[PDB]
């Protein structure tokens, strides 16, 4: 899809190896931010959706939280925090056409900047002047949306680039969008290495009559460590009682 | 605010023109740039406008045939290719264009070049 | 194409007299796409009135206009010595944005 058009695809209950994604040397950028791209199939991801669209190669360095430009701030805009992963590649022998191709678009003008994962995608005329427009083009009246004109003799700094914004919610509520790692058997009343969707620790899983909402996942104690968790297999509620210890 | 444009230029029957038009103070990006020929002595005539954002171009009907106007919003200048050219060409060349912040313009062209002037005969 | 006519040709005028041109169309045009401007010989073009009614930036007060439809007005309510020159008068609503003949004001005697 175009930038300005740019299109959302959420995912569920999937399994997925990011490992021969950045083994790959086809994407031309790929680039993390508030999770290492290495670390990935260890944290069972919760929150998970994958926008896609199409730039040119200078427009690259305007999908980065914090960055201005024609497409941050008229096409696509990321928040300061966000946190996911940005992948882009050359698609030059798919999205270019000999004498320009017509069918990708990005938004020209606004009169203010997009919020974070804002999509605009209106024809109005774009009245740069005190006159209004009536939908006519003409001085000071301008249609917002315009044409690459992607070439395959272009330069592969106008070079059609397919971008791909992965955005998640890491470890805040119960996941659904997983990855390939298998699961073993729990163990209560006895001191285990436990790791619940990618939180880790150490502690003895006892039996609880702490009531969970269907919503919440986590339990959290004064000091904002993990209290209890709810078993992603068996929808139990399970408290976390760090292995018992004491002076020596 | 300014609006510069090209030096005097001497050109031979049959051969074209580049005549150049370069914005500073307002942003150039949001604008639209006109141009406009003057014979020695005689009135203004219109050849065509182009906007800046888009380079969507629309040209005089007696200059559809000769002019290009084009535009670089990376060395925020706009240009005016004229070929075959001939003695009824020489004349004073003017660029106009509304200046504008980054979000509104003006309502019409207050800012012109000094212009360019062109000669041509054999 | 719509056609601009200039009014008078030479406007012959003493320093300190009240001087009128016009600007007939050949169709009726927008208000709000008339301007004014003038020009010295020599010198670029300088935008004196737009919007038919609308005094440009730093244009002296002295200059006024008024119309409607394909006759318009501009008035100097008192001819100054840095006013004598070429005046034009341009419809930028319909494309070709076509220009008028001029209109040269010159210090009567």
């Known amino acids: 899809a175009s930038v300005y058009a740019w299109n959302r695809k959420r995912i569920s209950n999937c399994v997925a190896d990011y490992s021969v994604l950045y083994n790959s040397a086809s994407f031309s950028t790929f680039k993390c931010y508030g999770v290492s791209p290495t670390k990935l199939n260890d944290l069972c991801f919760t929150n998970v959706y994958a926008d896609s669209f199409v730039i040119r190669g200078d427009e690259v360095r305007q999908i980065a939280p914090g960055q201005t430009g024609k497409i941050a701030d008229y096409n696509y805009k990321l928040p300061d925090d966000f946190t996911g992963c940005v992948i882009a590649w050359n698609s030059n022998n798919l999205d270019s056409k000999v004498g320009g191709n017509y069918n990708y678009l990005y938004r020209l003008f606004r009169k203010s900047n997009l919020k974070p994962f804002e999509r605009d995608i209106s024809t109005e005329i774009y009245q740069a002047g005190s006159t209004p427009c009536n939908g006519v083009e003409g001085f000071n009246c301008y249609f917002p949306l315009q044409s690459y004109g992607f070439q395959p003799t272009n330069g592969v700094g106008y070079q059609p680039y397919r971008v791909v914004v992965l955005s998640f919610e890491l470890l805040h509520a119960p996941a659904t969008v997983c990855g390939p790692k298998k699961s073993t058997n729990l163990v209560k009343n006895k001191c285990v290495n436990f790791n619940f969707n990618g939180l880790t620790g150490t502690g003895v899983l006892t039996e609880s009559n702490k009531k969970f909402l269907p919503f919440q996942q986590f339990g959290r104690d004064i000091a904002d460590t993990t209290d209890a968790v709810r078993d992603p297999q068996t929808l139990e509620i399970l408290d976390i009682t760090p292995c018992s210890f004491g002076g020596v | 605010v300014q609006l510069v444009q090209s030096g005097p230029e001497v050109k031979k029957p049959g051969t074209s023109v580049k005549v150049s038009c370069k914005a500073s103070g307002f942003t150039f990006t949001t604008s639209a740039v006109q141009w406009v020929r003057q014979a020695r002595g005689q009135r203004l005539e219109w050849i065509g406008w182009?906007?800046?954002?888009?380079?969507?171009?629309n040209y005089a009907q007696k200059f559809q045939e000769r002019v290009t106007i084009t535009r670089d919003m990376s060395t925020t200048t706009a240009y005016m290719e004229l070929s075959s050219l001939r003695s009824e060409d020489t004349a004073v060349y003017f660029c106009?264009?509304?200046?504008?912040?980054?979000?509104?313009?003006?309502?019409?062209?207050?800012?012109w070049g000094q212009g360019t002037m062109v000669t041509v005969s054999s | 194409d719509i056609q601009m006519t200039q009014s008078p040709g030479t406007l012959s005028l003493s320093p300190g007299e009240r001087a009128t041109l016009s600007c007939r169309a050949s169709?009726?045009?927008?208000?709000?796409?008339l301007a004014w401007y003038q020009q010295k010989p020599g010198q670029a073009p300088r935008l004196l009135i737009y919007?038919?009614?609308s005094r440009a930036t730093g244009i002296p007060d002295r200059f006024s206009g008024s119309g409607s439809g394909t006759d318009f007005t501009l008035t100097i309510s008192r001819l100054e010595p840095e006013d004598f020159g070429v005046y034009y008068c341009?419809?930028?609503?319909?494309?070709?944005?076509?220009f008028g003949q001029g209109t040269k004001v010159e210090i009567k005697r």
């Open positions: 106009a264009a509304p200046h504008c912040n980054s979000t509104s313009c003006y309502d019409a062209f207050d800012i």
């Open positions: 341009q419809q930028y609503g319909s494309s070709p944005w076509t």
């Open positions: 182009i906007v800046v954002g888009s380079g969507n171009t």
């Open positions: 919007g038919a009614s």
């Open positions: 169709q009726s045009v927008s208000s709000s796409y």
